[PDB]
Structure 1
Amino acid sequence: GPSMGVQVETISPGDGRTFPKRGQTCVVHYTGMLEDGKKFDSSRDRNKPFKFMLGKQEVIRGWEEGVAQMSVGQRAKLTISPDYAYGATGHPGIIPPHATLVFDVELLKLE
């Protein structure tokens, strides 16, 4: 009984009173790295932040439940599992089956 497959760790404290609401877009920079630390997709590498809407399901479950735990100006690392990321199949070549992923997002601003 571990409960919840998403672990977020605060690295840089932001506002602490400004969390992203459901329905609005969230501008944040992420970094996807395998369990070993091998990158597979970063938003900052292309010099462009990632904007998404909460509750719209435009992103992964571990992101909607994890990003909502941080406040504007906060930098935390979210641990996503193959159950919260894609499933038991995943994406062939980049995301293998039964594999844990690591993503580092930073709360820049809200739209």
Structure 2
Amino acid sequence: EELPQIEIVQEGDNTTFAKPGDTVTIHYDGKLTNGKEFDSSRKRGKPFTCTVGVGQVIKGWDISLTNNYGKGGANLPKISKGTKAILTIPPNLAYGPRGIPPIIGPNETLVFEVELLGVNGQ
């Protein structure tokens, strides 16, 4: 299957990993491949909290934060608490062929800078 690109820029505690159903808290920056930013929790003023692995965020996010639903994968490093990463997510794992104009265009790849701040409120 097709997976997102995950590059660790800062290692976490290598102990606290999130799994489907868990609640996570992260800070993130979202930009198009042309460098143009489309979303950012840091600029909004608060970290984002959500349930991962159940499709309540884009599929690329669920995969990165739960290590492919616990299945893992080829070249798919784990993200623990305190980990900074860069997520590259293809259209099929983002907003697909139609996209969400005028917020995001069709057939669009997305690049995220994410920092895992907490798992299950801790």
**TM > 0.5 fold call:** yes
2:39 paired with 1:45: no
Query: Do the aligned partners of 2:90 and 2:109 also contact (CA within 8 Å) in 1?
Result: yes
Instruction: Select the residue among 73, 88, 92 that pairs with 1:79.
Output: 88
Q: Deviation of residue 16 (structure 1)? A: 1.3
Q: Deviation of residue 24 (structure 1)? A: 1.8
Q: Deviations over 1:50-101 (max 9, x none)?
A: 1111233110110010122300000001001111001110101121112211
Instruction: Select the residue among 17, 27, 30 that pairs with 1:29.
Output: 27
Structure 2: gaps of 5 or more residues:
67-77
TM-score (norm 1): 0.91
TM-score (norm 2): 0.83
Name the stretch that deviates more: 34-43 or 53-62. 53-62
C-alpha distance in 1 between matches for 2:54 and 2:10: 27
C-alpha distance in 2 between matches for 1:21 and 1:65: 10
Structure 1: gaps of 5 or more residues:
none
C-alpha distance in 1 between matches for 2:3 and 2:101: 22
Find runs of 4+ consecutive structure 1 residues off by over 3 angstroms.
Answer: none
Q: Deviations over 1:26-60 (max 9, x none)?
A: 00011110001110000111120011112331101
Residue matched to 2:57: 59
C-alpha distance in 1 between matches for 2:102 and 2:44: 21
C-alpha distance in 1 between matches for 2:118 and 2:33: 28
Q: Which amino acid aligns with 2:81?
A: V
Query: Do the aligned partners of 2:33 and 2:111 also contact (CA within 8 Å) in 1?
Result: yes
Tell me the percent identity: 48
Q: Please report the RMSD computed on the Cα atoms of aligned residues, expressed in angstroms.
A: 1.2
Task: State the aligned residue count.
Answer: 109
